Design a protein around this ligand. Structure first.
Ligand code: CLA
Ligand code: CLA
Ligand code: CLA
Ligand code: CLA
Ligand code: CLA
Ligand SMILES: CCCCCCCCCCCCCCCC(=O)OC[C@H](COP(=O)(O)OC[C@@H](O)CO)OC(=O)CCCCCCCCCCCCCCC
Ligand SMILES: CC1=C(/C=C/C(C)=C/C=C/C(C)=C/C=C/C=C(C)/C=C/C=C(C)/C=C/C2=C(C)CCCC2(C)C)C(C)(C)CCC1
Ligand SMILES: CCCCCCCS[C@@H]1O[C@H](CO)[C@@H](O)[C@H](O)[C@H]1O
Lengths: 51, 122
Protein backbone atom coordinates (compact mmCIF):
# COMPACT_ATOMS: atom_id res chain seq x y z
CA UNK A 1 0.00 0.00 0.00
CA UNK A 2 0.80 3.71 -0.31
CA UNK A 3 2.31 5.34 2.77
CA UNK A 4 0.40 8.32 4.10
CA UNK A 5 2.75 10.91 2.54
CA UNK A 6 2.21 9.47 -0.99
CA UNK A 7 -1.62 9.23 -1.17
CA UNK A 8 -1.94 12.01 -3.73
CA UNK A 9 0.38 10.32 -6.24
CA UNK A 10 -2.67 8.44 -7.56
CA UNK A 11 -3.28 11.60 -9.62
CA UNK A 12 0.00 11.42 -11.57
CA UNK A 13 -1.41 9.28 -14.40
CA UNK A 14 -5.03 10.54 -14.16
CA UNK A 15 -5.42 13.95 -15.86
CA UNK A 16 -9.16 14.16 -15.23
CA UNK A 17 -8.86 13.65 -11.48
CA UNK A 18 -5.81 15.90 -11.34
CA UNK A 19 -8.02 18.64 -12.78
CA UNK A 20 -10.69 17.69 -10.22
CA UNK A 21 -8.13 18.03 -7.41
CA UNK A 22 -6.93 21.36 -8.81
CA UNK A 23 -10.56 22.50 -9.04
CA UNK A 24 -11.14 21.54 -5.40
CA UNK A 25 -8.00 23.41 -4.29
CA UNK A 26 -9.13 26.46 -6.26
CA UNK A 27 -12.56 26.22 -4.60
CA UNK A 28 -10.99 26.14 -1.13
CA UNK A 29 -8.74 29.14 -1.83
CA UNK A 30 -11.60 31.20 -3.30
CA UNK A 31 -13.81 30.20 -0.35
CA UNK A 32 -11.12 31.34 2.07
CA UNK A 33 -10.96 34.74 0.37
CA UNK A 34 -14.75 35.13 0.64
CA UNK A 35 -14.89 33.94 4.25
CA UNK A 36 -11.93 36.13 5.19
CA UNK A 37 -13.48 39.25 3.68
CA UNK A 38 -16.81 38.60 5.45
CA UNK A 39 -15.06 38.14 8.80
CA UNK A 40 -13.14 41.37 8.31
CA UNK A 41 -16.29 43.28 7.37
CA UNK A 42 -17.93 41.98 10.56
CA UNK A 43 -15.07 43.35 12.63
CA UNK A 44 -13.84 46.42 10.72
CA UNK A 45 -14.51 49.84 12.25
CA UNK A 46 -14.76 52.32 9.33
CA UNK A 47 -15.28 55.47 11.42
CA UNK A 48 -11.69 56.82 11.57
CA UNK A 49 -9.24 56.37 8.68
CA UNK A 50 -6.92 58.86 10.44
CA UNK A 51 -6.17 57.15 13.77
CA UNK B 1 -60.27 69.14 -11.53
CA UNK B 2 -59.81 69.19 -7.75
CA UNK B 3 -58.12 66.06 -6.45
CA UNK B 4 -59.83 63.67 -4.04
CA UNK B 5 -58.51 61.12 -1.57
CA UNK B 6 -58.72 58.36 -4.17
CA UNK B 7 -56.63 60.42 -6.61
CA UNK B 8 -53.97 60.80 -3.93
CA UNK B 9 -53.92 57.62 -1.82
CA UNK B 10 -50.65 55.72 -2.12
CA UNK B 11 -48.98 58.31 -4.38
CA UNK B 12 -46.84 60.00 -1.72
CA UNK B 13 -48.48 63.38 -2.41
CA UNK B 14 -50.13 63.22 1.03
CA UNK B 15 -46.67 63.77 2.56
CA UNK B 16 -45.90 66.76 0.29
CA UNK B 17 -46.64 70.39 1.18
CA UNK B 18 -48.42 72.62 -1.37
CA UNK B 19 -46.34 74.62 -3.80
CA UNK B 20 -46.96 78.01 -5.39
CA UNK B 21 -46.65 79.02 -9.03
CA UNK B 22 -43.49 80.75 -10.20
CA UNK B 23 -45.76 83.79 -10.65
CA UNK B 24 -46.22 84.05 -6.85
CA UNK B 25 -43.78 86.90 -6.20
CA UNK B 26 -46.24 89.33 -4.62
CA UNK B 27 -46.75 90.91 -1.22
CA UNK B 28 -49.39 90.31 1.46
CA UNK B 29 -50.26 93.56 3.28
CA UNK B 30 -50.25 93.58 7.08
CA UNK B 31 -52.68 95.95 8.82
CA UNK B 32 -51.30 96.56 12.32
CA UNK B 33 -54.87 96.93 13.59
CA UNK B 34 -56.10 93.62 12.18
CA UNK B 35 -55.54 90.27 13.88
CA UNK B 36 -54.21 87.34 11.89
CA UNK B 37 -53.59 83.65 12.23
CA UNK B 38 -51.78 80.98 10.30
CA UNK B 39 -54.62 78.66 9.29
CA UNK B 40 -52.23 76.00 7.95
CA UNK B 41 -48.47 75.55 8.27
CA UNK B 42 -46.87 72.56 6.51
CA UNK B 43 -43.22 71.48 6.77
CA UNK B 44 -41.89 68.86 4.36
CA UNK B 45 -38.37 67.61 5.20
CA UNK B 46 -36.17 66.90 2.20
CA UNK B 47 -32.85 66.27 3.97
CA UNK B 48 -31.85 64.88 7.37
CA UNK B 49 -28.25 65.55 8.43
CA UNK B 50 -26.67 64.19 11.61
CA UNK B 51 -23.65 65.84 13.24
CA UNK B 52 -20.77 63.37 13.46
CA UNK B 53 -19.12 62.89 16.85
CA UNK B 54 -15.30 62.92 16.57
CA UNK B 55 -12.78 61.41 18.96
CA UNK B 56 -10.55 64.52 19.16
CA UNK B 57 -12.44 67.60 20.35
CA UNK B 58 -10.03 69.81 18.40
CA UNK B 59 -11.47 68.53 15.11
CA UNK B 60 -14.56 70.40 13.91
CA UNK B 61 -17.51 68.06 13.40
CA UNK B 62 -19.57 68.10 10.21
CA UNK B 63 -23.12 67.19 9.26
CA UNK B 64 -23.24 63.98 7.23
CA UNK B 65 -26.04 62.54 5.07
CA UNK B 66 -28.41 59.83 6.22
CA UNK B 67 -30.92 57.47 4.64
CA UNK B 68 -34.54 57.75 5.74
CA UNK B 69 -35.86 54.30 6.68
CA UNK B 70 -39.37 55.17 7.94
CA UNK B 71 -40.89 56.05 4.53
CA UNK B 72 -43.16 58.98 3.63
CA UNK B 73 -44.25 59.72 7.19
CA UNK B 74 -42.14 62.78 7.95
CA UNK B 75 -44.08 65.99 7.30
CA UNK B 76 -45.66 68.33 9.81
CA UNK B 77 -49.00 69.72 8.73
CA UNK B 78 -52.35 71.21 9.71
CA UNK B 79 -50.44 73.47 12.12
CA UNK B 80 -52.23 76.64 13.17
CA UNK B 81 -51.73 79.49 15.60
CA UNK B 82 -51.94 83.19 16.21
CA UNK B 83 -49.90 85.58 14.04
CA UNK B 84 -49.21 88.63 16.21
CA UNK B 85 -48.33 92.10 14.95
CA UNK B 86 -45.77 93.47 17.41
CA UNK B 87 -45.40 97.15 18.23
CA UNK B 88 -42.15 97.37 16.25
CA UNK B 89 -43.93 96.00 13.14
CA UNK B 90 -42.50 92.49 13.40
CA UNK B 91 -44.76 89.43 13.25
CA UNK B 92 -44.73 86.60 15.78
CA UNK B 93 -46.28 83.20 15.08
CA UNK B 94 -47.36 81.37 18.25
CA UNK B 95 -48.01 77.70 17.44
CA UNK B 96 -51.13 76.36 19.15
CA UNK B 97 -52.09 73.04 17.58
CA UNK B 98 -51.71 70.62 14.70
CA UNK B 99 -49.80 67.57 13.53
CA UNK B 100 -46.62 69.20 14.83
CA UNK B 101 -44.34 66.16 15.36
CA UNK B 102 -43.27 63.00 13.52
CA UNK B 103 -41.04 60.22 14.81
CA UNK B 104 -38.32 59.70 12.19
CA UNK B 105 -35.52 57.14 11.92
CA UNK B 106 -32.57 57.88 9.63
CA UNK B 107 -29.55 55.67 9.07
CA UNK B 108 -25.91 56.71 8.85
CA UNK B 109 -23.29 55.16 6.63
CA UNK B 110 -22.32 52.00 8.44
CA UNK B 111 -25.84 51.25 9.70
CA UNK B 112 -26.26 53.35 12.86
CA UNK B 113 -29.91 54.32 13.20
CA UNK B 114 -30.83 57.79 14.51
CA UNK B 115 -34.44 58.12 15.76
CA UNK B 116 -35.68 61.65 16.37
CA UNK B 117 -38.93 63.44 17.09
CA UNK B 118 -38.96 65.87 14.19
CA UNK B 119 -41.14 68.66 15.60
CA UNK B 120 -42.00 72.33 16.02
CA UNK B 121 -43.98 71.85 19.25
CA UNK B 122 -44.75 75.16 21.02
C1 CLA C 1 -6.85 20.62 -1.30
C2 CLA C 1 -7.18 19.69 -0.43
C3 CLA C 1 -7.20 18.25 -0.81
C4 CLA C 1 -7.69 17.61 -2.05
C5 CLA C 1 -8.30 18.25 -3.26
C6 CLA C 1 -7.38 16.17 -1.78
C7 CLA C 1 -7.73 15.08 -2.71
C8 CLA C 1 -7.66 13.75 -2.53
N1 CLA C 1 -7.24 13.10 -1.44
MG1 CLA C 1 -6.17 14.09 0.18
N2 CLA C 1 -5.72 14.98 2.12
C9 CLA C 1 -5.78 16.30 2.36
C10 CLA C 1 -6.14 17.34 1.37
C11 CLA C 1 -6.71 17.13 0.03
N3 CLA C 1 -6.86 15.94 -0.57
C12 CLA C 1 -5.46 16.67 3.76
C13 CLA C 1 -5.43 18.04 4.40
C14 CLA C 1 -5.18 15.36 4.40
C15 CLA C 1 -4.81 15.09 5.84
C16 CLA C 1 -6.15 14.88 6.54
C17 CLA C 1 -5.36 14.40 3.28
C18 CLA C 1 -5.16 12.96 3.50
C19 CLA C 1 -5.66 12.02 2.50
C20 CLA C 1 -5.72 10.55 2.72
C21 CLA C 1 -5.41 9.59 3.83
C22 CLA C 1 -6.27 10.12 1.42
C23 CLA C 1 -6.46 11.25 0.63
C24 CLA C 1 -7.00 10.84 -0.68
C25 CLA C 1 -7.34 11.87 -1.69
C26 CLA C 1 -7.96 11.50 -3.00
C27 CLA C 1 -9.39 10.99 -2.69
C28 CLA C 1 -10.24 11.83 -1.72
C29 CLA C 1 -10.05 11.50 -0.24
O1 CLA C 1 -10.14 10.36 0.19
O2 CLA C 1 -9.73 12.55 0.71
C30 CLA C 1 -9.68 12.29 2.12
C31 CLA C 1 -10.60 13.21 2.89
C32 CLA C 1 -10.09 14.30 3.49
C33 CLA C 1 -8.63 14.56 3.34
C34 CLA C 1 -10.91 15.27 4.29
C35 CLA C 1 -10.03 16.32 4.97
C36 CLA C 1 -10.74 16.97 6.16
C37 CLA C 1 -10.06 18.25 6.64
C38 CLA C 1 -8.63 17.99 7.09
C39 CLA C 1 -10.88 18.86 7.77
C40 CLA C 1 -12.07 19.68 7.26
C41 CLA C 1 -13.21 19.73 8.28
C42 CLA C 1 -14.00 21.04 8.23
C43 CLA C 1 -14.44 21.39 6.81
C44 CLA C 1 -13.17 22.17 8.83
C45 CLA C 1 -12.79 21.97 10.30
C46 CLA C 1 -12.54 23.33 10.95
C47 CLA C 1 -12.45 23.30 12.47
C48 CLA C 1 -12.38 24.72 13.03
C49 CLA C 1 -13.62 22.54 13.11
C50 CLA C 1 -8.12 12.87 -3.65
C51 CLA C 1 -7.04 12.97 -4.73
C52 CLA C 1 -7.20 9.36 -0.67
C53 CLA C 1 -6.45 8.60 -1.75
O3 CLA C 1 -6.86 8.52 -2.90
O4 CLA C 1 -5.23 7.87 -1.45
C54 CLA C 1 -4.68 7.00 -2.45
C55 CLA C 1 -6.74 8.94 0.68
O5 CLA C 1 -6.69 7.75 1.15
N4 CLA C 1 -6.09 12.47 1.19
C1 CLA D 1 2.40 23.21 -5.63
C2 CLA D 1 2.99 22.71 -4.56
C3 CLA D 1 3.10 21.24 -4.36
C4 CLA D 1 2.36 20.09 -4.96
C5 CLA D 1 1.25 20.10 -5.97
C6 CLA D 1 2.99 18.92 -4.29
C7 CLA D 1 2.61 17.50 -4.58
C8 CLA D 1 3.15 16.36 -4.10
N1 CLA D 1 4.14 16.24 -3.21
MG1 CLA D 1 5.42 17.94 -2.60
N2 CLA D 1 6.29 19.55 -1.45
C9 CLA D 1 5.94 20.84 -1.61
C10 CLA D 1 4.99 21.37 -2.61
C11 CLA D 1 4.08 20.58 -3.46
N3 CLA D 1 3.97 19.25 -3.44
C12 CLA D 1 6.62 21.76 -0.67
C13 CLA D 1 6.49 23.25 -0.52
C14 CLA D 1 7.46 20.85 0.13
C15 CLA D 1 8.36 21.20 1.28
C16 CLA D 1 7.35 21.33 2.42
C17 CLA D 1 7.20 19.52 -0.47
C18 CLA D 1 7.85 18.34 0.13
C19 CLA D 1 7.39 17.00 -0.27
C20 CLA D 1 7.95 15.75 0.29
C21 CLA D 1 9.02 15.40 1.29
C22 CLA D 1 7.11 14.76 -0.45
C23 CLA D 1 6.25 15.46 -1.27
C24 CLA D 1 5.38 14.52 -2.02
C25 CLA D 1 4.33 15.00 -2.99
C26 CLA D 1 3.42 14.07 -3.74
C27 CLA D 1 2.39 13.40 -2.80
C28 CLA D 1 1.94 14.33 -1.67
C29 CLA D 1 0.96 13.71 -0.69
O1 CLA D 1 0.29 12.72 -0.93
O2 CLA D 1 0.80 14.35 0.59
C30 CLA D 1 -0.22 13.96 1.49
C31 CLA D 1 -0.21 14.89 2.69
C32 CLA D 1 -0.95 14.63 3.78
C33 CLA D 1 -1.84 13.43 3.83
C34 CLA D 1 -0.95 15.55 4.97
C35 CLA D 1 0.09 16.66 4.89
C36 CLA D 1 -0.16 17.57 6.10
C37 CLA D 1 0.79 18.76 6.16
C38 CLA D 1 2.20 18.31 6.52
C39 CLA D 1 0.28 19.74 7.20
C40 CLA D 1 -1.03 20.44 6.80
C41 CLA D 1 -0.95 21.25 5.51
C42 CLA D 1 -2.12 22.22 5.36
C43 CLA D 1 -3.41 21.45 5.59
C44 CLA D 1 -2.20 22.82 3.96
C45 CLA D 1 -2.08 24.34 3.81
C46 CLA D 1 -0.88 24.60 2.90
C47 CLA D 1 -0.60 26.05 2.52
C48 CLA D 1 -0.38 26.92 3.74
C49 CLA D 1 0.63 26.09 1.61
C50 CLA D 1 2.59 15.05 -4.57
C51 CLA D 1 3.04 14.95 -6.03
C52 CLA D 1 5.75 13.14 -1.63
C53 CLA D 1 6.26 12.28 -2.73
O3 CLA D 1 7.16 12.63 -3.47
O4 CLA D 1 5.61 11.02 -2.98
C54 CLA D 1 6.19 10.17 -3.99
C55 CLA D 1 6.83 13.32 -0.63
O5 CLA D 1 7.46 12.39 -0.02
N4 CLA D 1 6.34 16.84 -1.24
C1 CLA E 1 -7.17 26.32 -25.32
C2 CLA E 1 -8.05 26.21 -24.36
C3 CLA E 1 -7.67 26.16 -22.93
C4 CLA E 1 -8.06 27.12 -21.86
C5 CLA E 1 -8.93 28.34 -21.98
C6 CLA E 1 -7.37 26.56 -20.66
C7 CLA E 1 -7.52 27.17 -19.32
C8 CLA E 1 -7.22 26.65 -18.11
N1 CLA E 1 -6.69 25.45 -17.88
MG1 CLA E 1 -5.75 24.20 -19.49
N2 CLA E 1 -5.42 22.60 -20.96
C9 CLA E 1 -5.71 22.76 -22.26
C10 CLA E 1 -6.20 24.01 -22.90
C11 CLA E 1 -6.81 25.16 -22.22
N3 CLA E 1 -6.68 25.43 -20.91
C12 CLA E 1 -5.48 21.53 -23.06
C13 CLA E 1 -5.69 21.32 -24.52
C14 CLA E 1 -5.00 20.55 -22.06
C15 CLA E 1 -4.62 19.11 -22.27
C16 CLA E 1 -5.89 18.30 -22.05
C17 CLA E 1 -5.01 21.33 -20.80
C18 CLA E 1 -4.59 20.70 -19.54
C19 CLA E 1 -4.90 21.38 -18.27
C20 CLA E 1 -4.72 20.73 -16.95
C21 CLA E 1 -4.23 19.38 -16.52
C22 CLA E 1 -5.18 21.85 -16.05
C23 CLA E 1 -5.52 22.93 -16.85
C24 CLA E 1 -6.00 24.07 -16.02
C25 CLA E 1 -6.52 25.35 -16.62
C26 CLA E 1 -7.07 26.50 -15.80
C27 CLA E 1 -6.07 27.16 -14.84
C28 CLA E 1 -6.61 28.49 -14.32
C29 CLA E 1 -7.80 28.36 -13.39
O1 CLA E 1 -8.26 27.29 -13.01
O2 CLA E 1 -8.42 29.58 -12.91
C30 CLA E 1 -9.52 29.56 -11.99
C31 CLA E 1 -10.78 29.26 -12.76
C32 CLA E 1 -11.56 30.25 -13.22
C33 CLA E 1 -11.21 31.69 -12.99
C34 CLA E 1 -12.80 29.90 -14.00
C35 CLA E 1 -12.63 30.48 -15.39
C36 CLA E 1 -13.87 30.25 -16.22
C37 CLA E 1 -13.92 28.78 -16.60
C38 CLA E 1 -12.74 28.43 -17.48
C39 CLA E 1 -15.23 28.47 -17.32
C40 CLA E 1 -15.28 26.98 -17.60
C41 CLA E 1 -16.40 26.66 -18.58
C42 CLA E 1 -15.89 25.74 -19.68
C43 CLA E 1 -17.04 25.42 -20.64
C44 CLA E 1 -15.30 24.47 -19.06
C45 CLA E 1 -14.13 23.91 -19.86
C46 CLA E 1 -12.86 24.74 -19.66
C47 CLA E 1 -11.74 24.24 -20.55
C48 CLA E 1 -12.03 24.49 -22.02
C49 CLA E 1 -10.42 24.91 -20.18
C50 CLA E 1 -7.54 27.46 -16.89
C51 CLA E 1 -9.05 27.57 -16.84
C52 CLA E 1 -5.93 23.65 -14.60
C53 CLA E 1 -7.26 23.69 -13.90
O3 CLA E 1 -8.30 23.51 -14.50
O4 CLA E 1 -7.30 23.96 -12.48
C54 CLA E 1 -8.52 24.05 -11.74
C55 CLA E 1 -5.41 22.26 -14.64
O5 CLA E 1 -5.18 21.51 -13.62
N4 CLA E 1 -5.39 22.73 -18.24
C1 CLA F 1 0.75 30.16 -4.28
C2 CLA F 1 -0.04 29.79 -3.28
C3 CLA F 1 -0.23 28.37 -2.87
C4 CLA F 1 0.52 27.12 -3.21
C5 CLA F 1 1.71 26.98 -4.11
C6 CLA F 1 -0.24 26.08 -2.44
C7 CLA F 1 0.13 24.64 -2.44
C8 CLA F 1 -0.48 23.60 -1.83
N1 CLA F 1 -1.59 23.65 -1.11
MG1 CLA F 1 -2.82 25.47 -0.95
N2 CLA F 1 -3.79 27.30 -0.13
C9 CLA F 1 -3.43 28.53 -0.52
C10 CLA F 1 -2.29 28.84 -1.41
C11 CLA F 1 -1.31 27.89 -1.97
N3 CLA F 1 -1.29 26.56 -1.77
C12 CLA F 1 -4.28 29.61 0.04
C13 CLA F 1 -4.15 31.10 -0.18
C14 CLA F 1 -5.26 28.86 0.87
C15 CLA F 1 -6.41 29.37 1.71
C16 CLA F 1 -5.93 29.41 3.14
C17 CLA F 1 -4.85 27.45 0.67
C18 CLA F 1 -5.60 26.36 1.33
C19 CLA F 1 -5.14 24.97 1.20
C20 CLA F 1 -5.81 23.82 1.87
C21 CLA F 1 -7.01 23.64 2.76
C22 CLA F 1 -4.94 22.72 1.42
C23 CLA F 1 -3.95 23.25 0.60
C24 CLA F 1 -3.04 22.18 0.14
C25 CLA F 1 -1.86 22.47 -0.74
C26 CLA F 1 -0.90 21.39 -1.19
C27 CLA F 1 -1.58 20.40 -2.15
C28 CLA F 1 -0.56 19.48 -2.85
C29 CLA F 1 -0.05 18.46 -1.86
O1 CLA F 1 -0.51 17.33 -1.80
O2 CLA F 1 1.01 18.78 -0.94
C30 CLA F 1 1.38 17.86 0.07
C31 CLA F 1 1.57 18.62 1.37
C32 CLA F 1 2.71 19.30 1.59
C33 CLA F 1 3.81 19.34 0.57
C34 CLA F 1 2.90 20.04 2.88
C35 CLA F 1 3.09 21.54 2.68
C36 CLA F 1 3.40 22.16 4.03
C37 CLA F 1 3.19 23.67 3.98
C38 CLA F 1 4.11 24.29 2.94
C39 CLA F 1 3.48 24.25 5.36
C40 CLA F 1 2.67 23.55 6.44
C41 CLA F 1 3.58 23.25 7.62
C42 CLA F 1 2.84 23.06 8.95
C43 CLA F 1 2.68 21.58 9.28
C44 CLA F 1 1.50 23.76 8.93
C45 CLA F 1 0.78 23.56 10.26
C46 CLA F 1 -0.63 24.12 10.18
C47 CLA F 1 -1.45 23.65 11.36
C48 CLA F 1 -0.99 24.32 12.64
C49 CLA F 1 -2.93 23.89 11.09
C50 CLA F 1 0.11 22.22 -1.98
C51 CLA F 1 1.41 22.26 -1.19
C52 CLA F 1 -3.56 20.89 0.67
C53 CLA F 1 -2.62 19.96 1.39
O3 CLA F 1 -1.62 20.32 1.99
O4 CLA F 1 -2.94 18.55 1.38
C54 CLA F 1 -2.21 17.66 2.23
C55 CLA F 1 -4.73 21.26 1.50
O5 CLA F 1 -5.47 20.46 2.17
N4 CLA F 1 -3.99 24.64 0.41
C1 CLA G 1 -12.35 36.56 -12.30
C2 CLA G 1 -11.50 36.11 -11.42
C3 CLA G 1 -11.12 36.90 -10.22
C4 CLA G 1 -11.07 38.36 -9.93
C5 CLA G 1 -11.43 39.54 -10.79
C6 CLA G 1 -10.59 38.36 -8.51
C7 CLA G 1 -10.33 39.61 -7.77
C8 CLA G 1 -9.73 39.76 -6.57
N1 CLA G 1 -9.29 38.79 -5.77
MG1 CLA G 1 -9.81 36.66 -6.10
N2 CLA G 1 -9.52 34.54 -6.63
C9 CLA G 1 -9.88 34.02 -7.80
C10 CLA G 1 -10.50 34.79 -8.89
C11 CLA G 1 -10.62 36.26 -8.97
N3 CLA G 1 -10.33 37.14 -8.01
C12 CLA G 1 -9.66 32.56 -7.90
C13 CLA G 1 -9.94 31.61 -9.04
C14 CLA G 1 -9.07 32.24 -6.58
C15 CLA G 1 -8.58 30.93 -6.01
C16 CLA G 1 -7.19 30.76 -6.58
C17 CLA G 1 -9.04 33.54 -5.91
C18 CLA G 1 -8.48 33.60 -4.56
C19 CLA G 1 -8.22 34.91 -3.97
C20 CLA G 1 -7.49 35.06 -2.70
C21 CLA G 1 -6.86 34.11 -1.72
C22 CLA G 1 -7.52 36.54 -2.59
C23 CLA G 1 -8.19 37.05 -3.70
C24 CLA G 1 -8.22 38.53 -3.64
C25 CLA G 1 -8.84 39.35 -4.72
C26 CLA G 1 -8.81 40.85 -4.71
C27 CLA G 1 -7.32 41.28 -4.81
C28 CLA G 1 -6.66 40.66 -6.05
C29 CLA G 1 -5.14 40.61 -5.98
O1 CLA G 1 -4.45 41.23 -5.19
O2 CLA G 1 -4.43 39.77 -6.91
C30 CLA G 1 -3.02 39.85 -7.02
C31 CLA G 1 -2.64 39.02 -8.22
C32 CLA G 1 -1.37 38.75 -8.52
C33 CLA G 1 -0.25 39.29 -7.68
C34 CLA G 1 -1.08 37.91 -9.74
C35 CLA G 1 0.23 37.14 -9.68
C36 CLA G 1 0.49 36.52 -11.04
C37 CLA G 1 1.76 35.69 -11.07
C38 CLA G 1 2.97 36.58 -10.85
C39 CLA G 1 1.86 35.04 -12.44
C40 CLA G 1 3.11 34.19 -12.60
C41 CLA G 1 2.83 33.13 -13.67
C42 CLA G 1 2.75 33.68 -15.09
C43 CLA G 1 2.27 32.61 -16.05
C44 CLA G 1 4.12 34.18 -15.51
C45 CLA G 1 4.21 34.66 -16.96
C46 CLA G 1 3.53 36.01 -17.15
C47 CLA G 1 3.60 36.50 -18.58
C48 CLA G 1 2.67 37.69 -18.77
C49 CLA G 1 5.03 36.91 -18.92
C50 CLA G 1 -9.53 41.14 -6.03
C51 CLA G 1 -10.93 41.64 -5.69
C52 CLA G 1 -7.56 38.97 -2.37
C53 CLA G 1 -8.69 39.49 -1.50
O3 CLA G 1 -8.80 40.67 -1.18
O4 CLA G 1 -9.72 38.61 -1.00
C54 CLA G 1 -10.88 39.19 -0.36
C55 CLA G 1 -7.09 37.69 -1.77
O5 CLA G 1 -6.47 37.58 -0.66
N4 CLA G 1 -8.67 36.12 -4.61
C1 LIG H 1 3.88 15.01 2.34
C2 LIG H 1 4.85 16.16 2.48
C3 LIG H 1 4.86 16.75 3.89
C4 LIG H 1 6.12 17.57 4.08
C5 LIG H 1 6.02 18.55 5.26
C6 LIG H 1 7.42 19.05 5.65
C7 LIG H 1 7.39 20.25 6.61
C8 LIG H 1 8.75 20.53 7.25
C9 LIG H 1 9.69 21.42 6.43
C10 LIG H 1 10.69 20.67 5.53
C11 LIG H 1 11.78 19.93 6.30
C12 LIG H 1 12.61 19.03 5.39
C13 LIG H 1 12.90 17.63 5.96
C14 LIG H 1 12.66 16.55 4.90
C15 LIG H 1 13.26 15.17 5.17
C16 LIG H 1 13.03 14.29 3.95
O1 LIG H 1 13.70 14.39 2.94
O2 LIG H 1 11.97 13.30 3.89
C17 LIG H 1 11.64 12.65 2.67
C18 LIG H 1 10.40 11.80 2.92
C19 LIG H 1 10.14 10.91 1.71
O3 LIG H 1 11.32 10.12 1.53
P1 LIG H 1 11.23 8.62 0.94
O4 LIG H 1 10.22 8.56 -0.17
O5 LIG H 1 12.63 8.15 0.68
O6 LIG H 1 10.60 7.88 2.23
C20 LIG H 1 11.39 7.43 3.32
C21 LIG H 1 10.46 6.61 4.20
O7 LIG H 1 10.63 5.24 3.83
C22 LIG H 1 10.85 6.72 5.67
O8 LIG H 1 11.91 5.78 5.90
O9 LIG H 1 9.30 12.69 3.04
C23 LIG H 1 8.54 12.55 4.25
O10 LIG H 1 8.93 11.78 5.11
C24 LIG H 1 7.28 13.37 4.39
C25 LIG H 1 6.80 13.46 5.83
C26 LIG H 1 7.50 14.54 6.64
C27 LIG H 1 6.54 15.00 7.73
C28 LIG H 1 7.15 15.88 8.80
C29 LIG H 1 6.14 16.06 9.94
C30 LIG H 1 4.92 16.89 9.55
C31 LIG H 1 3.94 16.97 10.72
C32 LIG H 1 3.19 18.30 10.75
C33 LIG H 1 2.35 18.48 12.01
C34 LIG H 1 1.10 19.27 11.64
C35 LIG H 1 0.14 19.49 12.80
C36 LIG H 1 -1.14 20.15 12.29
C37 LIG H 1 -2.11 20.52 13.40
C38 LIG H 1 -3.49 20.83 12.86
C1 LIG I 1 -21.87 24.82 -3.16
C2 LIG I 1 -22.62 25.90 -3.89
C3 LIG I 1 -22.80 27.13 -3.33
C4 LIG I 1 -22.23 27.46 -1.98
C5 LIG I 1 -20.93 27.74 -1.78
C6 LIG I 1 -20.29 28.07 -0.47
C7 LIG I 1 -21.12 28.56 0.70
C8 LIG I 1 -18.95 27.93 -0.33
C9 LIG I 1 -18.20 28.22 0.91
C10 LIG I 1 -16.86 28.12 0.93
C11 LIG I 1 -16.04 28.39 2.14
C12 LIG I 1 -16.69 29.08 3.31
C13 LIG I 1 -14.75 28.01 2.18
C14 LIG I 1 -13.79 28.19 3.30
C15 LIG I 1 -12.51 27.75 3.16
C16 LIG I 1 -11.52 27.92 4.25
C17 LIG I 1 -10.25 27.43 4.23
C18 LIG I 1 -9.71 26.65 3.05
C19 LIG I 1 -9.32 27.66 5.36
C20 LIG I 1 -8.10 27.08 5.40
C21 LIG I 1 -7.19 27.37 6.52
C22 LIG I 1 -5.88 27.04 6.60
C23 LIG I 1 -5.14 26.31 5.51
C24 LIG I 1 -5.14 27.49 7.79
C25 LIG I 1 -3.87 27.15 8.10
C26 LIG I 1 -3.22 27.72 9.32
C27 LIG I 1 -3.75 27.59 10.56
C28 LIG I 1 -5.03 26.83 10.86
C29 LIG I 1 -3.09 28.16 11.79
C30 LIG I 1 -2.20 29.34 11.41
C31 LIG I 1 -1.21 28.87 10.37
C32 LIG I 1 -1.91 28.48 9.07
C33 LIG I 1 -2.18 29.75 8.26
C34 LIG I 1 -0.93 27.59 8.30
C35 LIG I 1 -23.56 28.20 -4.07
C36 LIG I 1 -24.68 28.73 -3.16
C37 LIG I 1 -22.57 29.30 -4.40
C38 LIG I 1 -24.21 27.71 -5.36
C39 LIG I 1 -23.32 26.75 -6.12
C40 LIG I 1 -23.17 25.52 -5.25
C1 LIG J 1 -22.60 39.02 0.68
C2 LIG J 1 -23.44 38.94 1.93
C3 LIG J 1 -23.48 40.30 2.62
C4 LIG J 1 -24.20 40.21 3.96
C5 LIG J 1 -24.02 41.50 4.76
C6 LIG J 1 -24.33 42.68 3.88
C7 LIG J 1 -24.58 43.92 4.72
S1 LIG J 1 -23.27 45.06 4.47
C8 LIG J 1 -22.73 45.47 6.11
O1 LIG J 1 -23.78 46.25 6.72
C9 LIG J 1 -23.50 46.64 8.07
C10 LIG J 1 -24.69 47.41 8.66
O2 LIG J 1 -25.13 48.45 7.77
C11 LIG J 1 -22.20 47.44 8.17
O3 LIG J 1 -21.90 47.69 9.54
C12 LIG J 1 -21.02 46.71 7.54
O4 LIG J 1 -19.93 47.64 7.43
C13 LIG J 1 -21.35 46.17 6.15
O5 LIG J 1 -20.31 45.26 5.77
Amino acid sequence: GLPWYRVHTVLINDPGRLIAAHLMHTALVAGWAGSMALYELATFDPSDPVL
Amino acid sequence: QTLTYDDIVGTGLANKCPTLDDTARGAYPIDSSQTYRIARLCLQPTTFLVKEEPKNKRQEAEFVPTKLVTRETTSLDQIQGELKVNSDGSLTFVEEDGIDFQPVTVQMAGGERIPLLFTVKN
